[PDB]
């Protein structure tokens, strides 16, 4: 239905005069600048959290244990103590290396890891970002190695040529000898974001033991957790099952700063947008006190008919909300178009001003995604209306104190 | 009293109501600019503190600009220390910088080579763990590795490493072989930064690249954040300009791009505050129809009636920028003096605040200019109307 203070005040807003026709355009776009930008500004941070669990959190092992500068001899009977833990899903061994690439005198330091190609599909998704048609070429006895995208941009190589890497010296005792090198062909490249593409390389486990003259021995055991946030309590008790103490690490010391920085902008852009609508709510006060003294010959007519103080005070609260709801919804209906179609928008400005921004060198990703939700749209409508309630309550108390005896009635 | 006729017609207009609420509406345009400046200087003071902390830990530990030749190395007898007269340079020191690789008994890491002079003052002097400065003698091949570099290599004090130069290599008819020598370590150093993992100290005299001469001259600038203005100056002959943008050209350029996004996000507060002057002054002409037309009957020309509302739009921009910069400098300086007002971060590691005095003048002059461009449209409408139709 309709109320006495809502349905009878649509005709009060139909006011004309001199330059008052342009004030309703300024007051609409003045309050839409803190609503439409907050829709795109909050949905873009939700797009960064969507790509965080897909491009970063789904490729690096979270928990890693290593011995104190010793090869893992008893690594066969140390796998059952990890797998039968309430919170550990899968586990796979890995042998990390530190080798360089000298194929044309280029500066590139990669981190080669001895992952298992048959067990890499149980804990994460390694070959899910390879441009090749398949990934089943990782057999035993072909000395293949796959590198990232950032390695190929400096090596100036393609798929199917013999590149030269630097094998570290696998000496039994501490002595200096000639550096070991070998020529291997690359089996395709991989690209995720541009940040983890220049220092990422892997080798099969059957080919890593022949380069170090070792038998069945690894140097690290990875794992997979069900919940990721509690990564500092399930890896502590899983270390004393083999020996006294081992080198314990997690993803907090390396990639743990991304979850902190994605919540700091939400605790900064939120209060910075209250100051945008807060000055925009002063535009409602500037047109409400003017609507009292200019319409002073109308409030005295209602007081002679029997209007109480509770009715007159409720006149200009919802009257100022009519110009507030029209301007707040004018930023909502234009905020869906920018958020859902942000990918033709960001790519249009980068080809006009010259050099593009958001480069894939030290940043998080290359593109600017926007995962638009429907809970943030409801959270900005109440914020734009609660800030307009205090802007329409203080001129409403001034209009309620206007006695009809002072005015010429 | 008040012989200037422009300012006398607005002294009683800035505040006309007697109650406390009616006086607050006339000063609503001042607080919207005051809250916009103090939310712009304070937030950018934290971002300037992050750039100043990153400068003293990265740019303060590496050579910023090296004046090297274009035909290879540089002869010190042709270009002495008392020959260069470059602007912003307060100290000239020789250095030899080359992209080399490392070699140890455990792994093969990466790291550049920096040829320092032990007879001069070194910025990494308190970072050496019980290692003196004059232990880099020519012929003994001593090298001071980093702390994070020796962790992945496993080299303690008293071992031997191998330094190979892939770039500066000689010609050999059987192919391409690099020039490598033997180097013994004497100790490490730690500075709690990121440049300790790919930098090492070595003597200036070395025959591992060519020939004995140097490559260039290491210089110190008053402001290492900008090098584009110090590149088109009077450069000496036989030498080219090599700044720090060849390696860290995407790191410190990333901080300047993030300040332009936060500075544009917080610029929307003064954009709506400039729109409030159109509402505060545009509605004043529609109600004061009996005051604008009565001035033209007294003898006021329409050229002077336009500047009456111009000061009314400038009274919120001038006082709003001085009060906004005063309150913005008070929150940034007294942030962590007695108690954290905005909250306590999860680390608590002495959050720095850098307040640049030149940046306040650039910010305050923007709000003093955006408050006058929105004033020209209500001021033109007060003079374009005829003084005959306004009164009947």
């Amino acid at each position: 239905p309709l109320s006495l203070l809502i349905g009878l005040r649509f005709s009060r807003g139909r006011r004309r005069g001199g330059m008052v026709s342009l004030i309703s355009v300024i007051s609409t776009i003045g309050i839409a600048l803190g609503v439409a930008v907050l829709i795109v500004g909050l949905s873009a941070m939700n797009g960064f959290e969507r790509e965080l669990n897909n491009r970063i959190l789904a490729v690096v092992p979270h928990g890693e244990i290593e011995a104190v500068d010793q090869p893992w001899t008893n690594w066969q009977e140390a796998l059952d103590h990890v797998q039968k833990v309430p919170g550990i899903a899968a586990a796979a061994p890995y042998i990390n290396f530190t080798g360089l690439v000298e194929s044309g005198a280029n500066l590139r330091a990669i981190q080669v890891k001895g992952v298992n190609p048959q067990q890499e599909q149980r804990l994460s998704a390694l070959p899910s970002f390879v441009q090749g048609d398949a990934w089943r070429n990782f057999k035993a006895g072909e000395q293949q190695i796959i590198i990232g995208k950032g390695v190929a941009d400096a090596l100036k190589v393609k798929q199917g040529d013999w590149v030269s890497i630097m094998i570290p010296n696998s000496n039994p005792e501490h002595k200096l000898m000639q550096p070991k090198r070998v020529r291997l062909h690359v089996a395709g490249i991989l690209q995720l974001s541009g940040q983890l593409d220049h220092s990422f390389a892997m080798i099969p486990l059957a080919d890593a033991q022949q380069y170090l003259d070792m038998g069945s021995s690894v140097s690290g055991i990875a794992l997979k957790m069900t919940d990721v946030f509690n990564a500092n309590k399930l890896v502590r008790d899983a270390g004393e099952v083999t020996n006294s103490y081992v080198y314990i690490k997690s993803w907090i010391g390396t990639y743990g700063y991304m979850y902190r920085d994605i919540q700091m902008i939400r605790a900064i852009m939120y209060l910075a947008m209250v100051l945008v609508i807060g000055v925009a709510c002063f535009n409602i006060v500037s047109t409400l006190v003017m609507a009292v003294k200019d319409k002073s010959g109308d409030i005295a007519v209602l007081r002679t008919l029997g209007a109480k103080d509770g009715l007159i005070r409720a006149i200009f609260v919802w009257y100022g909300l009519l110009a507030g709801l029209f301007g707040s919804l004018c930023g909502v209906i234009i905020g869906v178009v920018v958020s859902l179609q942000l990918t033709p928008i960001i790519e249009w400005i980068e080809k006009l001003i010259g050099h593009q921004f958001l480069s894939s060198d030290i940043y998080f990703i290359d593109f600017l995604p926007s995962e638009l939700h429907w809970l943030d749209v409801f959270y900005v409508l109440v914020t734009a209306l609660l800030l307009s309630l205090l802007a329409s309550w203080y001129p409403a108390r001034r209009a309620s104190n206007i006695d009809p005896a002072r005015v010429l009635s | 009293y008040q012989p200037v006729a422009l300012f006398i017609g607005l002294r009683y207009m800035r505040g006309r109501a007697a109650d406390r609420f009616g006086r607050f509406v006339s000063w609503l345009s001042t607080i919207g600019i005051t809250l916009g400046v103090m939310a712009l200087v304070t937030v950018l003071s934290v971002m300037n503190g992050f750039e100043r902390e990153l400068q003293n830990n990265i740019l303060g530990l590496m050579p910023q600009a090296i004046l090297s030749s274009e035909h290879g190395s540089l002869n010190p007898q042709q270009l002495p220390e008392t020959a260069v007269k470059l602007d912003g340079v307060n100290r000239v020191a020789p250095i030899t910088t080359g992209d080399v690789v490392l070699q140890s008994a455990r792994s093969v890491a990466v790291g550049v080579m920096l040829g320092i002079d032990p007879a001069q003052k070194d910025p990494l002097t308190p970072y050496l763990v019980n290692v003196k400065q004059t232990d880099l003698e020519p012929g003994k091949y001593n090298v001071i590795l980093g702390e994070q570099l020796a962790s992945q290599l496993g080299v303690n004090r008293g071992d031997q490493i191998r330094v190979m130069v892939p770039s500066a290599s000689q010609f050999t008819p059987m192919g391409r072989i690099p020039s490598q020598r033997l180097f013994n370590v004497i100790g490490t150093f730690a500075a709690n930064s990121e440049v300790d993992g790919y930098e090492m100290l070595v003597n200036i005299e070395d025959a591992s690249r060519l020939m004995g001469n140097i490559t260039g001259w290491r210089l110190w600038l008053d402001e290492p954040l900008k090098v584009d203005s110090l590149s088109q100056q009077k450069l000496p002959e036989g030498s080219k300009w090599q700044d720090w943008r060849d390696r860290k050209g995407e790191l410190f350029q990333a901080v300047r791009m993030e300040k332009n996004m936060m500075g544009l996000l917080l610029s929307l507060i003064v954009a709506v505050a400039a729109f409030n002057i159109i509402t505060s002054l545009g509605l004043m002409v529609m109600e004061k129809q009996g005051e604008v037309a009565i001035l033209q009957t007294q003898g006021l020309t329409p050229r002077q009636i336009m500047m009456v509302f111009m000061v009314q739009g400038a009274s919120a921009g001038i006082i709003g920028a001085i009060l906004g910069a005063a309150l913005g400098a008070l929150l940034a300086s007294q942030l962590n003096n007695l108690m954290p007002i905005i909250g306590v971060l999860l680390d608590g590691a002495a959050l720095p605040v850098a307040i640049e005095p030149l940046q306040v003048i650039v910010i305050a002059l923007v709000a003093m200019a955006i408050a006058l461009l929105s004033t020209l449209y209500p001021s033109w409408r007060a003079a374009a109307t005829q003084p005959a139709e306004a009164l009947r």
């Binding site: 080198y247 314990i248 690490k249 997690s250 907090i252 010391g253 390396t254 700063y257 920085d261 | 971002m47 992050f50 750039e51 990153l54 990121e194 990333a254 901080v255 993030e258 680390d347 590691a349």
Partner: peptide, 10 residues
């Protein structure tokens, strides 16, 4: 962003 510490834990 531009606020990096890069400290590891053992």
């Amino acid at each position: 962003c531009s606020s990096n510490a890069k400290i590891d834990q053992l």
